Design a protein around this ligand. Structure first.
Ligand SMILES: Nc1nc2c(ncn2[C@@H]2O[C@H](COP(=O)(O)OP(=O)(O)OP(=O)(O)O)[C@@H](O)[C@H]2O)c(=O)[nH]1
Ligand SMILES: Nc1ncnc2c1ncn2[C@@H]1O[C@H](COP(=O)(O)OP(=O)(O)CP(=O)(O)O)[C@@H](O)[C@H]1O
Ligand SMILES: Nc1nc2c(ncn2[C@@H]2O[C@H](COP(=O)(O)OP(=O)(O)O)[C@@H](O)[C@H]2O)c(=O)[nH]1
Ligand SMILES: [Ca+2]
Ligand SMILES: [Ca+2]
Ligand SMILES: [Ca+2]
Ligand SMILES: [Ca+2]
Ligand SMILES: [Mg+2]
Ligand SMILES: [Mg+2]
Ligand SMILES: [Mg+2]
Ligand SMILES: [Mg+2]
Lengths: 54, 424, 437, 334
């Protein structure tokens, strides 16, 4: 094995042991998604109220 | 505060609704005058779901009593807990509905519906967070069936984003008032298919059979039938009236129980049904709860498949043993649960048992076998409609035969829709 | 010093955050009223614990935390709990009606009305940071808020804090405690939307915690309080490097450097030992070798899976208590010759070790016993893809019949987001199998 | 009432096991995609091990060991025997093999040229379509048209009368406790053609090849299958020894060695689900009564006469040991 990068302090210590070597959308686009879904809710509710009006 | 607004319409709707408020007022420690006299804070923790708090720390049921004649509502006001209801919430006419869906829906009920909605609006305006509505009614009469569904339609228009929940009593020739009940029930079922989120199918056929075969009551009355309804209504609302994680409100219940919007008709079950001092074990609760003889819909669950199941255990018992027995029933009879909805059985436990029992269990099933109920109504409908028998009671109120034909087709489609998922 | 802001979303995120911040106070000696006598720099300082706590003039140590829930009942517990004085009302955001276990309701309908308020409250805490390094987001997969509102928050945080790291602590759904049938839907929907926005996510399967509580703590029917105390121990050992002096995992960026060589594959497996019942009067204290060997037993993992039939990309051993480097290496040498530990060929076969001399703190009156030494292993193994395979299979069963889909479409969500999210998971499973086979 | 699912219809072994479980009246068969099972008789390819052991209130058991393909593939077995120190390349009961991709070509040639120069037996065999040739160029050209080339046992023990070749199939069952059970009944799949060390019919003892190309199929024994009672009597009459001493000790040693090697990689001792598996070991015996391992089969078929006894033994020690209701094996201890 091999122990590398030994760092010590009062509260503890850390090290690394090696055994073998190797071999975003914008706010505008987000707002469009949120309002598109709200538009589909309004359309679905308007059709319900239309159905109830008949 | 997630409030529910309760509405009871017609003779059956008010008689079972009155007993429901008597049963749950006793569970929450409310007396016939509205004063609280319990000994557990669990009684008051979710009290505002069904009760408004008035002056002097009085608890007033958030209930609205509707009928087209004053007879049954006068009996309620004269009943034990009659004084607890808000007097303004008594909305009644004088003509009646003659067991006629058209009178309740189109003529006599149309004259009274707006004043009912004024009271619904008054109750809803003070709600900090309204869940939705709870309607008790029968489908075989005229007021509860015809005016009840008119109310459901006008409430949905004014509150489209609220849950609509009903307790709907299905007619049976075993407990029949008039021959036109299949007409009234068929017209009402299509309304429920479109305008409710959850409907508990309470079959007077099943209530009669339970009273006769099981409870050994040779001559069952409506009081005997309504005792089964009271205990069932208490059980299915336990998760709404006490603190808990599962199905604690009307919408979360709907999301767990309704995989397809039109298939929202539930088979309720209850255990025990004793004709009384013997201790009932958790295994016995589970076996009886799932037994067809304890179902309130007169459908054989082994003739269909369970889409979703909600189970509620009440009393001081081992939740470990409850989990084991619930898993036992699923793993024992996994052929009766659809394999394309994983973990579709949910279990809740409440520490407070109902009155008179140390332990109880309530079953809420969305089974495709409920098509047997709708087939039965459909066959009784068609036997008369093919001869246009008794139609003049309805055409005399403005209805056309086409509206009956459309109602016939609507319920046959519902039957076909249940059958498609029973073989999928 | 660089501050970290913790965000707790939904019931599971809030209640777990409440358990963690309780443990942080006990570990750092912070009293419920916010006072910390051991802190000599009154009303300020750039110590290691200040990454998680700000300081008022009166000496109160305030968590850098925000709690968000669409229903007020759970956060009201924090408003009146034991540590109610730690937080000011601006840190606690509640709504009226929750997302009803509906991802679309949490993301589109209800989340749209509160997302700007939450970001404003996060901006208040960020303005108190001299060098904010990022966020730790606590949430469930299955809830409507924990899944739906989180993915919306993670999208906006990438916009407002593009250079900041974001780490997740995620509760994977388990039927033994789940409360909704559609939790597989919400899990796939929230993983698809959050994947590009999360740099490192620690998944906790409620099934694994439930059985550890039953088997190792002798709890018959574990509650959320039992589960959350154990989860907070794992979270504490993961974040101890940010709150204490040390040289391993000293900032959030080092978590990705040490554990996530491939961005989409950012779900390390956590294993914790020992879990001892406080009901046992005397218990044989386990050695360094015994607790390290326990890190390769599936019975101790946060997700039940078989690392022997996958490949490793990284491994961190985080020790707390009486542990010296000599015994760690002796334990690793013995384990390598007995266990099946295969790394990918483009990664070194090795372990990064961190030791903190302070042994784990137990909540007084809890279920966990005090131990002389404990260890949390963080291993990025392809075997954790078994969790995605289980989840995607349940998704496929329900979605083939469009069961419950109308609840999501009714909230404005389109049906195409279901299949798009499922295709992303299909690509995720393919990535794991390419690396690990 | 236990439950089980069937996901491999081409399995003659577990078709009988499924029939036996239903005959007990205490096992109910579910649909193949029903997750609420106790026992999975799984498929051969891509068995979803990751979905096992996640059903609350259900002890789940599967009839395959995840990772046992490392032992049941040609290239995997060769790599496992060489790389594992528990077996080592100095392993004496495994023919000198090499993995060739259409890689160990330079090592296979370093040994081939050493044999041609060494004036010793230089006949090899390639397989994964089998070619037996003493010319390495004909073997390497055949692969390009993953394989392994191992030393062909040029001096096999030949049965008389007939002067013919054979191989020994042993059935081994490993239960959830990793107990290794050797079925007391094996079969000798014999060639019915006289061995000519100068045709691929007297050299290949496969049951399908002897039934399609061999002219003397069934002449000496029925179905070119000699069982252990006859083979033990022959060894006593012809060589003055027993099947136990001359062969079975080596067979039990090889079986134990192979399965102990992979035990830490495939054991389900501390796993959320349990595994058992039936293996088919294939051995060769040379003229000096030395046993050589040829191949381990992960989904083997059984002999017709032995289907009844072996499948009942699977139910007894592998299924009913986990799911009790209301010896034909030799336990190889370790
Ligand atoms: N470990 C743990 N899991 C929890 C806890 N609370 C809820 N869960 C799990 O989280 C999932 C449900 O998500 P919740 O957090 O309760 O729902 P939510 O985020 O509040 O969103 P809503 O649907 O709007 O209520 C289920 O799988 C629960 O088992 C908790 O305190 N600890
Ligand atoms: N190294 C070797 N030396 C001599 N003969 C050999 C040999 N390898 C194989 N054979 C002969 O050739 C036959 C084919 O070997 P192999 O093990 O590849 O069969 P197979 O895998 O196709 C069917 P099964 O799965 O039942 O074993 C063997 O039965 C054996 O008789
Ligand atoms: N279970 C039950 N069913 C009833 C009761 N009263 C009436 N019914 C049923 O309801 C139908 C008659 O409807 P009813 O409520 O009397 O008519 P309405 O007053 O116009 O709504 C018939 O099918 C009866 O069997 C009752 O108290 N309990
Ligand atoms: Ca009039
Ligand atoms: Ca008016
Ligand atoms: Ca300070
Ligand atoms: Ca980013
Ligand atoms: Mg009447
Ligand atoms: Mg919630
Ligand atoms: Mg970044
Ligand atoms: Mg083969």
């Amino acid at each position: 094995m091999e122990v590398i990068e030994l760092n010590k302090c009062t509260s503890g210590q850390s090290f690394e042991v090696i055994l073998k070597p190797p071999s975003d959308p914008s706010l505008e686009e987000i707002q469009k998604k949120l309002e598109a879904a709200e538009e589909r809710r309004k359309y679905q509710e308007a059709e319900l109220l239309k159905h109830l009006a008949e | 505060m997630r409030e529910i607004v309760h509405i009871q319409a017609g003779q059956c709707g008010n008689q079972i609704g009155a007993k429901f408020w008597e049963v749950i007022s006793d569970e929450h420690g409310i007396d016939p005058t509205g004063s609280y006299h319990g000994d557990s804070d669990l009684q008051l923790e979710r009290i505002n779901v069904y009760y408004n708090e008035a002056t002097g720390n009085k608890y007033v049921p958030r209930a609205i009593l509707v009928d087209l004649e004053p007879g049954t509502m006068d009996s309620v006001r004269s009943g034990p807990f009659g004084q607890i209801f808000r007097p303004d919430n008594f909305v009644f006419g004088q003509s009646g509905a003659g067991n006629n869906w058209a009178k309740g829906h189109y003529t006599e009920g149309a004259e009274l519906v707006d004043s009912v909605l004024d009271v619904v609006r008054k109750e809803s305006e003070s709600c900090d967070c309204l869940q939705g509505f709870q309607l008790t009614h029968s489908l075989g009469g005229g007021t509860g069936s015809g005016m009840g569904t008119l109310l459901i339609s006008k409430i949905r228009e004014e509150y489209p984003d609220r849950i609509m929940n009903t307790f709907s009593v299905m007619p049976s020739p075993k407990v029949s008032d008039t021959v036109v009940e299949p007409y009234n029930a068929t017209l009402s079922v299509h309304q429920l298919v479109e305008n409710t989120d959850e409907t508990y199918c309470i079959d007077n056929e099943a209530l009669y059979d339970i009273c006769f075969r099981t409870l050994k009551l040779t001559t069952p009355t409506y009081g005997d039938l309504n005792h089964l309804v009271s205990a069932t209504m208490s059980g299915v609302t336990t998760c709404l009236r006490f603190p808990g994680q599962l199905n604690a409100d009307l919408r979360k219940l709907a999301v767990n129980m309704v995989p397809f919007p039109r298939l929202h008709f539930f088979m309720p079950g209850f255990a025990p049904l004793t004709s009384q001092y013997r201790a009932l074990t958790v295994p016995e609760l589970t076996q009886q709860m799932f037994d067809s003889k304890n179902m309130m819909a007169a459908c054989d669950p082994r003739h269909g498949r369970y889409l979703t199941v909600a189970a509620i255990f009440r009393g001081r018992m081992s939740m470990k043993e409850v989990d084991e027995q619930m898993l036992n029933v699923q793993n024992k009879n996994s052929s009766y649960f659809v394999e394309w909805i994983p973990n579709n059985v949910k279990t809740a436990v409440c520490d407070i048992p109902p009155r008179g029992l140390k332990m109880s269990a309530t079953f809420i099933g969305n089974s495709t076998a409920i098509q047997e109920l709708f087939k039965r109504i459909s066959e009784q409908f068609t036997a008369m409609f093919r001869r246009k028998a008794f139609l003049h009671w309805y055409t005399g109120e403005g209805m056309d035969e086409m509206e009956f034909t459309e109602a016939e087709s609507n319920m046959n489609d519902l039957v076909s829709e249940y059958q498609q998922y029973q073989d999928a | 010093m660089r501050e970290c802001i913790s965000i707790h979303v939904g019931q599971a995120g809030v209640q777990i955050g409440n358990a963690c911040w309780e443990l942080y106070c006990l570990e750092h000696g912070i009293q419920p009223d916010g006072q910390m006598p051991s802190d000599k720099t009154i009303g300020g300082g750039d110590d290691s614990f200040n990454t998680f706590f700000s300081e008022t003039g009166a000496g109160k140590h305030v968590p850098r935390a925000v709690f968000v829930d669409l229903e007020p009942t759970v956060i009201d517990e924090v408003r009146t709990g034991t540590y109610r004085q730690l937080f000011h009302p601006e840190q606690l955001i509640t709504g009226k009606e929750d997302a009803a276990n509906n991802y679309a309701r949490g993301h589109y309908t209800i989340g749209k009305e509160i997302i700007d308020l939450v970001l404003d409250r996060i901006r208040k805490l960020a303005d108190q940071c001299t060098g904010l390094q990022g966020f730790l987001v606590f949430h469930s997969f299955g809830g409507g808020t924990g899944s739906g509102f989180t993915s919306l928050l993670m999208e906006r945080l990438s916009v407002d804090y593009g250079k900041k790291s974001k780490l997740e602590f995620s509760i994977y759904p388990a039927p033994q405690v789940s409360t909704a049938v559609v939790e597989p839907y919400n899990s796939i929907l929230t993983t698809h939307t959050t994947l590009e926005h999360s740099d490192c996510a620690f998944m906790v399967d409620n099934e694994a915690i439930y059985d550890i509580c039953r088997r190792n703590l002798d709890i018959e029917r574990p509650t959320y309080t039992n589960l959350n105390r154990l989860i907070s121990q794992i979270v504490s050992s993961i974040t101890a490097s940010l709150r204490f002096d040390g040289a391993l995992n000293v900032d959030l960026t080092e978590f990705q450097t040490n554990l996530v060589p491939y961005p989409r594959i950012h779900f390390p497996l956590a294993t914790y030992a020992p879990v001892i019942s406080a009901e046992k009067a005397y218990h044989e204290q386990l050695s360094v070798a015994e607790i390290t060997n326990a890190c390769f037993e599936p019975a101790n993992q946060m997700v039940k899976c078989d690392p022997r039939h996958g490949k490793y990309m990284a491994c961190c051993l985080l020790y707390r208590g009486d542990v010296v480097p000599k015994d760690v290496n002796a334990a690793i040498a013995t384990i390598k010759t007995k266990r099946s530990i295969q790394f990918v060929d483009w990664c070194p076969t090795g372990f990064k070790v961190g030791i903190n001399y302070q042994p784990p703190t137990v909540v007084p009156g809890g279920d966990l016993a005090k131990v002389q030494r404990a260890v949390c292993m963080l291993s990025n193994t392809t075997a954790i893809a078994e969790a995605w395979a289980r989840l995607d299979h349940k998704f496929d069963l329900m979605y083939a019949k469009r069961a419950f889909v109308h609840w999501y479409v009714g909230e404005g969500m389109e049906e195409g987001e279901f299949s798009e999210a499922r295709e992303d998971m299909a690509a995720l499973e393919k990535d794991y199998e390419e690396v690990g086979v | 009432m236990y439950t089980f699912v069937v996901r491999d219809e081409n399995s003659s072994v577990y078709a009988e096991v499924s029939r036996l479980l239903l005959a007990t009246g205490q096992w109910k068969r579910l649909r193949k995609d029903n997750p609420r099972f106790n026992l999975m008789l799984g498929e051969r390819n891509r068995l979803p091990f990751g979905r096992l052991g996640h059903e609350p209130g259900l002890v789940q058991l599967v009839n395959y060991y995840r990772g046992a393909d490392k032992l049941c593939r040609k290239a995997s077995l060769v790599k496992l025997i060489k790389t594992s120190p528990e077996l080592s390349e100095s392993c004496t009961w495994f023919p000198e093999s090499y993995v060739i991709y259409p890689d160990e070509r330079e090592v296979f040639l370093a040994a081939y040229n050493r044999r041609r120069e060494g004036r010793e037996g230089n006949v090899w065999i390639a397989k994964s379509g089998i070619l037996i040739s003493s010319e390495a160029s004909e073997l390497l050209d055949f692969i390009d048209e993953v394989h392994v080339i191992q030393k062909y046992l040029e001096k096999p023990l030949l049965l008389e009368p007939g002067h013919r070749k054979f191989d020994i199939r042993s059935w081994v069952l490993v239960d959830h406790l990793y107990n290794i059970y050797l079925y007391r009944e094996g079969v000798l799949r014999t060639s019915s053609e006289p061995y000519n060390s100068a045709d691929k019919t007297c050299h290949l003892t496969n049951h399908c090849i002897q039934k399609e190309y061999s002219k003397n199929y069934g002449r000496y024994e029925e179905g070119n299958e000699m069982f252990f009672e006859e083979f033990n009597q022959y060894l006593m009459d012809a060589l003055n020894t027993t099947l136990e001493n001359s062969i079975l000790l080596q067979i039990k040693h090889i079986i134990r060695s192979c399965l102990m090697c992979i035990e830490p990689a495939i054991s389900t001792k501390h796993l959320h689900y349990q595994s058992f598996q039936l293996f088919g070991f294939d051995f060769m015996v040379d003229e000096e009564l030395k046993v050589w391992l040829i191949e381990v089969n992960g989904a083997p078929a059984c002999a017709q006469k032995l289907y009844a006894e072996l499948c009942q033994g699977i139910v007894d020690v592998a299924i009913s040991s986990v799911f009790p209701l209301a010896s034909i094996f030799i336990k190889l201890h370790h």
